[PDB]
Amino acid sequence: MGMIIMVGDGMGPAYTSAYRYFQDNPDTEEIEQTVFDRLLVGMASTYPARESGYVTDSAASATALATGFKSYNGAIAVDINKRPLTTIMQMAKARGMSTGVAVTAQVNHATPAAFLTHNESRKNYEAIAADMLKSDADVILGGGRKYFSEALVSQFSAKGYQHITELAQLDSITQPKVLGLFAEVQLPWVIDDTDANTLSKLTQKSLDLLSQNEKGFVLLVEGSLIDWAGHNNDIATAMAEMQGFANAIEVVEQYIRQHPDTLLVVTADHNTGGLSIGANGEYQWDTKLPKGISASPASIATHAIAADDWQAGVNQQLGFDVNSTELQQLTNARMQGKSTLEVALKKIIDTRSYTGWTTSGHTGVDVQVFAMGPAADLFKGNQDNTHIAEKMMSLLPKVN
Amino acid sequence: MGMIIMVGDGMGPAYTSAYRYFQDNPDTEEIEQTVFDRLLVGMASTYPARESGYVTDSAASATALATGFKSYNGAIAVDINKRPLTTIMQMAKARGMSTGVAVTAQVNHATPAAFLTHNESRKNYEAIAADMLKSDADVILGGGRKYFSEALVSQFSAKGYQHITELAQLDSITQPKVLGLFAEVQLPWVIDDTDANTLSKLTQKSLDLLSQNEKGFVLLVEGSLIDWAGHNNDIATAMAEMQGFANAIEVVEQYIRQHPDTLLVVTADHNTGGLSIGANGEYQWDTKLPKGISASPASIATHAIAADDWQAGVNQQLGFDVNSTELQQLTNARMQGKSTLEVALKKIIDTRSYTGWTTSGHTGVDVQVFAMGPAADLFKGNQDNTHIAEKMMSLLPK
């Protein structure tokens, strides 16, 4: 059977709840269900191994999801004693099934890394990239050109991989073994791109290849930038990444309607930023304003710094006109640089929209577990994140 | 059948998740499950009627859970056109079933008010109180002596209600119709009390009386002060209220083990304060420190401002010795008053515990739904809060 594990990096309960309200049609009376609402089946604890406290990082959480083992923050498929653990992908391969990963961050980032490689530290990018050549994964799509040298790519070409760097080349890929690196590091923010279908395209392509194996497959799809946006406390950019992730989930749903013998599992590796729908004593979340933001605070700050006359440009991208107080704040910030300007912009956006945050890091709240397919009910209720791995693994073909 | 609807007021996902870690035994390697972990079945959206935006208040959400209808923020069992809605309590009474409410806030606060009365505004405390005289609820336990005049109490007595004001009198109550008002307004914080069993006692007493009705009953239990602590961004006091609510939930589980034909549903009305486990870039939550706090910042402050030698007192109640800079922040806040001192203490608690907050009000994140009993599966997955009402109502006899 086919299997798809989708991870909304840093997508705690607030993110999915926010997405519903953000996408709510202001003209329709009721609030329309989102794909998350339709697929919710349970929740999961995200804590790492005891020695790391109660707040996990992406490496530890991904390790739990791919191996069913807890481990220290930073660990990449190795246990607390740095012993390499068998990932579900290895189990799949050992069973002659196809495997793959499609993400928006570098293909060698923590999450995908924990599914295809083993390393005592997530910081070892080049070694992890090289180790991926041992996984023999059929599909590797995402960013991270910076981490693969001409010589490494050559080794990948020798083992039968087709190397591509432009989305325009996807159409010509119709056979297993593809290494697609579509960006130096992470792919472009959805809010600043031509549309929100890039992750969906990598997903649809993965399914097209993987599904040609009668024995089945295990595909990992990660909405990696939800987390990055969360760290930046960037709500407008976060919601855009949420749409990109939701579109991909839709891609898989359609696939399942056409391939009934499949299991889809969607979850978060952890929560990021402490996002809150409503803030500062305000009992409301102004979604009308966010929808009007057509660019990332970074994009808006870059432009504002490059233009002599920038004020009109900022209001045009924010979707509203800044007042005198906020104008002076953008003015001072601009003199101090791009970074300080972005922060100034996000402060205005957050104050205007009543969006809250508690940290630039992670938080420990349990995340949601979603699923679709015959075995969906195995993931009902509360469970630890490691249990998600054990369940998916229990569906793989018999030992003999 | 027997039915129990337990509401953890303001108890979003962060609270129950925090509670697990807060309760985590430092000695055992594994993190033990909580009663919430064992009972979780789904989640619910909490938004109120469209005219009120996406963020609900307690009155609107309580109305949804009790009637299955959305309404504006502040509404007490009336729709957007201010029309009175039939609550599950009314439906229950109409079926000859017993009803009751047990809470830690005033008995006429938003939530319980939505289950027993009808009013266009939660603020009309006097009318709501008077209106409870018409609900015919067999059990009404909580705080709120402040809202029941001697004449009103007199009227309740004429209807067969036994009036009590001290927990010492519970034992003497063995028959239907009791008005228990155990405080001027809300009951004492769990962290400043003798133990976290007060709500469990009101709960157990409700079950004892209600279960004597062969036709069944519908009981509302609310851990009301979780929300209050959340509003004051008070984590140590919030965790204590969670313990008291978790104990009450345990009382009901025990009950069910002895009364198989029962349904328990636990949920929250909405989230409060934007609480977060970890904060300010720190990837951790210092639970060792919170556990050491033995009193509410409020209590700590009042005592500190009242005392001469207060330095050692604060450290003693915080469980850790404050530092140079923190002492001066406290010394100064202490000069302005109890309130400014409380804020200074909470700032220190949050900073050193890595506990975050985003507001003093509510937030819109969905909340969890827990259930136990034969019909527990009806509450699986995602649902709107109004649907929890519909499902519970569908199990009513007829």
Ligand SMILES: [Mg+2]
């Ligand atoms: Mg990653």
Ligand SMILES: [Mg+2]
């Ligand atoms: Mg929220």
Ligand SMILES: [Mg+2]
């Ligand atoms: Mg209340």
Ligand SMILES: [Mg+2]
């Ligand atoms: Mg949290």
Ligand SMILES: [Zn+2]
């Ligand atoms: Zn992160």
Ligand SMILES: [Zn+2]
């Ligand atoms: Zn509240």
